[PDB]
């Protein structure tokens, strides 16, 4: 899948 969480801002995405 393509689900990750960027640390730059601190927001995570969905599938």
């Amino acid at each position: 899948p393509i689900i990750y969480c960027n640390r730059r801002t601190g927001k995570c995405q969905r599938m």
Side-chain angles (χ1 to χ4, degrees):
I2 36 62
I3 201 303
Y4 71 117
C5 313
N6 252 130
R7 67 122 305 201
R8 283 101 234 285
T9 165
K11 169 263 256 286
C12 203
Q13 270 279 283
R14 69 257 123 82
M15 56 161 233

